[PDB]
Amino acid sequence: QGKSKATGTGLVYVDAFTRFHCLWDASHPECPARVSTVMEMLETEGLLGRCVQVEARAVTEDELLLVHTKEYVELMKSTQNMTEEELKTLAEKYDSVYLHPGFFSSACLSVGSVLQLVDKVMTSQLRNGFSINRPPGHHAQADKMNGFCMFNNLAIAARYAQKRHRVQRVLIVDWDVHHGQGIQYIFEEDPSVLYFSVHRYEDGSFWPHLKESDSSSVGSGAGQGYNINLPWNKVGMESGDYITAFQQLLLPVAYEFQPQLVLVAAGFDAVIGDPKGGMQVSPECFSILTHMLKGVAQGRLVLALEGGYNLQSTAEGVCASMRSLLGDPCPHLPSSGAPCESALKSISKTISDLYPFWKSLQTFEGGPLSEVSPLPAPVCAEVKVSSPITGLVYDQRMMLHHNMWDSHHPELPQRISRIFSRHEELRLLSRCHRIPARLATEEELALCHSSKHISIIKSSEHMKPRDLNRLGDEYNSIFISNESYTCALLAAGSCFNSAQAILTGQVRNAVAIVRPPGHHAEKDTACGFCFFNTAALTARYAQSITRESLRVLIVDWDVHHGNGTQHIFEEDDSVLYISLHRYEDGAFFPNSEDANYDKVGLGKGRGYNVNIPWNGGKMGDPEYMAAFHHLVMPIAREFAPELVLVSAGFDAARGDPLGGFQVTPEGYAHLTHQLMSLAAGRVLIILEGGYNLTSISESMSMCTSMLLGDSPPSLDHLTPLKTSATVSINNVLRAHAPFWSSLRVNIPESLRLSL
Ligand SMILES: [K+]
Ligand SMILES: [K+]
Ligand SMILES: [K+]
Ligand SMILES: [K+]
Ligand SMILES: [Zn+2]
């Protein structure tokens, strides 16, 4: 691997795409200036030179006939030789169409451009690609033109992928503001292709004015379940509406479908300023939506230009998508990370209409969730996008903390040396920027810990063994050594240096290979192998070097609940703590009911503490992924953090001696990939628990691989879920829906109980 890795982004553009235009209406919205403005901006932004130039080719007859009829193809071919009057006379026969003697030539190159990128991506020459092509395609049907489309580019490309590259399952995502009814028809009774379209509808009042554009059209025959319409029934939708639809509906379904290729009908008429869409999505949104789709199909992703009729807005939308293909860090979302009621209705309605067919959607119990006014959903100041640098911090001195009386205690020094070695083997170390380690100050520790607790541990640099054994027994599950203080100082100060590097723009994200852990340590006591809460301290340090009100998200996927972390921020609305953890109705460590789902924080901090408790089974990727789709990411998005810290305990990992759970290194990669679209990519991953040296070295290397931008890995089946996990997920939905609107899926109990 390495030199042979598929990393490039393919771009197809040919001057032929400008050679045809409307002859009888010089004001027609589908015009040459569309693609040439996209190309002009791609160069102005410096994105064009970063793409691999891929040549266009003419689609062949047998390729067209994967979708179209020979009678229709030959009619379209014959247009080359028609007069303007003949062309107009033929165009009249179709809904919203014009013709031009060069239309057929460019249409053939428009289809073939997608096939070229599919070739390059499935033969693993390139990571992904984007054709800047016109005419568009998603409205075209087997035997007729429609909606400025002659041939259905992506439908042909889907079947081409299956026939020539032996792809089994293709996902087509259609975020163009119109319904791509041509694609829906073509794959109506075909479960080898899953078609998702999100589009303006308003109860059929918006073109194409079809009953079948509604969420009730789920496909038929063998294809029933594999066609999904998300119709917006009010105009003015924003990024939070699209992003919530992707979180609550599309991504669960897509991860369950396990496609091998994603084709995107990338129309940008949903963007601010488009004269036909009437929506208000900011271009930045399509950096997010693109990043999301890189999760399924191991990043095998091909975008093709569909609609988009404001020239700047379309070009800005393409640039926002291209930056994500090129692996640039996501922007801060300009709008709020919260959906509106009409979006939640359309989303819930579509979930309900598809609920029988998708076991991921069946995660929802149903019944009414809250409709109280939610917490504020703020927006973050713009951070200028730059090439992503991943920081890495590690120092061998953090091995010196140890247990003299029990050589077999799981918090082994070698945890961080094995993790670092695996980074050096997989060459991740040389790809990262090496952040220097440093000691936290007493002043910095005072940001969360009492001067008593600080002074106690400070004396341990000198306390003798038998005192260290007594002291350890004053705490729940703690051992101590004469270096434990210095190690805990580095585990904090190294995360400070990382947070400083992130927030000053020296790096964009970072990984901190540190011990001892912190997320159990309290204001005033050590606990659960932790002395100082380096996660909480780092959040405060971030607030100290930026501004006191800087929003920070702490995600804790350690199998243990970080009680100390919960408490330090239980009244705080400037820091959001989300924890996934084993609980067993209170039996599992730390044996406190603080870790239950109904502990939503206290005071101004109500809603700013999310507990996802696991009971009754081996939990793994399927449950942790569903928790992220339905809880972690919706809430995090709505909170709109400016920095993400991860209490990264790999003790939920397969083969961990303490957790008993079966999260895989591939799962951890996808959890990391999810979080990378938050906080404009400002993620810092801090090691907590996890004690199987093999599983943690593999898991954290995968996390860093994601931070560095590599394609997400393959996964086991993510359905069915354990039923206790389903129950606990819905408990968090009910607990936190009054605070967070992105959670408010309202599907009736009737559908759950009708299966
Ligand atoms: K659509
Ligand atoms: K289908
Ligand atoms: K369109
Ligand atoms: K946790
Ligand atoms: Zn742990």
Automatic annotation (TrEMBL):
Binding site for Zn(2+) 3: 556, 565, 647
Single GO BP term: angiogenesis
Keyword Zinc among record annotations: yes
Organism: Danio rerio
Keywords noted in UniProt: Actin-binding, Cell projection, Chromatin regulator, Cytoplasm, Cytoskeleton, Hydrolase, Metal-binding, Methylation, Nucleus, Phosphoprotein, Repeat, Repressor, Transcription, Transcription regulation, Transferase, Ubl conjugation, Ubl conjugation pathway, Zinc, Zinc-finger
Residues binding Zn(2+) 5: 569, 575
Known pathway: Protein modification; protein ubiquitination
Name of the featured protein: Protein deacetylase HDAC6
Compartments in which it is found: Cell projection, Axon; Cell projection, Dendrite; Cytoplasm, Cytoskeleton, Cilium basal body; Cytoplasm, Cytoskeleton, Microtubule organizing center, Centrosome
Lineage: Eukaryota, Metazoa, Chordata, Craniata, Vertebrata
Residues of the full protein shown: 55 to 809 of 1081
Catalysed transformations (reactions): N(6)-acetyl-L-lysyl-[alpha-tubulin] + H2O = L-lysyl-[alpha-tubulin] + acetate; N(6)-acetyl-L-lysyl-[protein] + H2O = L-lysyl-[protein] + acetate
Similarity annotation: Belongs to the histone deacetylase family. HD type 2 subfamily.
Molecular function (Gene Ontology), one example: protein lysine deacetylase activity
Binding locations of Zn(2+) 6: 599, 736
Principal subcellular localisation of the protein: other
